[PDB]
Design a protein around this ligand. Structure first.
Ligand SMILES: [Mg+2]
Lengths: 213, 215
């Protein structure tokens, strides 16, 4: 079954805890959003993994270069997974992956923004097994909605051998759009953190996922 | 005009960064909070450095990939003068960062680290972006990628498009002559200055060479 991941796009740890204290046990993966990474630094990863050691902790650093250096910083902070931005030089993804293996962790290519299928093949040849199909928050704000082109691309990435994570302002009602595809993880940030009842929002996602898959 | 000199603070902690800034703050023109420092300490790095060197241009190399408004505001509220947006970002991200930047009398640079296209470059110009950082990837460099003719061609084309171009990527003093004759806006040096036996003299050598090559 696709796992449920909560994106913590908070600017401070105390703000993030307002959410984790409610739904940490309701999700499978706790993500240190890029916003939290920039707001508090890598201490966010160390602090959250210490609080929820039984959960997968993802450092959404969107590494663009210095793959080995930035990845090591995140893994020394006890991250399980780290993200590398899609436009990064292939050697950046390779460097981050080499370090990830040292800590029994993994690397995800964050598909936020522009990337090519040739790049996608390089990631596979490099040993990358995860990608995050992400409808940009800014694109979303500009009126870009989920469409068949997205479903087609997601299926293509899956066929390439990638475990695909889907995210980008997902609402409960959006889940059916991806039915039939072996989605690895569904990430919900705003739809969970800002819901009237974060606990219910999280349980609803898991209920729908269990039903559809 | 002479290309200015920018120091990249790719340190993991503030104290490490200060071991460098206490030496070269008055030897360079721009103080950059490297992405590594941004990730290591968070936006406080920007606030603390600007507080120490308020008369200097402080650049937050956040390499914003999305949430342009949110991330840029975090940096500008921390008193940054400039912020970077990664080249693959949706055009709306660059636009969002630029709108916030204008509110703080700051600016945005597109960080050309990794893959990008000329079509995207035209979008940045149309969006009002006036600075780009032509960056030879550190990881590509480690893999043997050297500065070459193709880089010079792209840099010149970017300049002709109206962008003020910053050049960086494992630059050694000996690499400066390769860019002679081009109106480079800024040269960024990280390792070549921070890790030198004498960071002060390393910075002064870059300045002397620049003054000679563009004088
Ligand atoms: Mg995220």
């Amino acid at each position: 079954l696709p796992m449920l991941q909560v994106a913590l796009d908070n600017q401070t740890m105390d703000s993030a805890y307002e959410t984790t204290r409610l739904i940490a046990e309701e999700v499978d993966i706790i993500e240190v959003g890029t916003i939290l990474c920039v707001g508090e630094g890598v201490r966010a990863v160390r602090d959250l993994k210490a609080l929820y050691p039984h959960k997968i902790v993802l450092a959404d650093a969107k590494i663009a270069d210095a793959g080995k250096i930035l990845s090591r910083m995140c893994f020394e902070a006890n991250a399980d997974w780290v993200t590398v931005i899609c436009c990064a030089d292939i050697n950046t993804a390779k460097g981050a992956l080499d370090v990830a293996k040292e800590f029994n962790g993994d690397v995800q290519i964050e598909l936020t923004g522009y990337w090519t299928w040739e790049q996608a093949q390089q990631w596979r040849d490099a040993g990358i097994g995860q990608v995050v199909y992400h409808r940009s928050r800014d694109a979303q704000a500009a009126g870009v909605a989920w469409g068949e082109a997205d479903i087609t691309a997601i299926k293509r990435l899956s066929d390439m051998g990638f475990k695909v994570t889907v995210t980008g302002g997902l609402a409960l009602e959006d889940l059916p759009l991806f039915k039939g595809i072996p989605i690895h993880v569904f990430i919900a940030g705003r739809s969970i953190r800002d819901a009237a009842s974060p606990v219910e929002a999280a349980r609803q996602f898991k209920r729908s996922i269990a039903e559809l898959w």
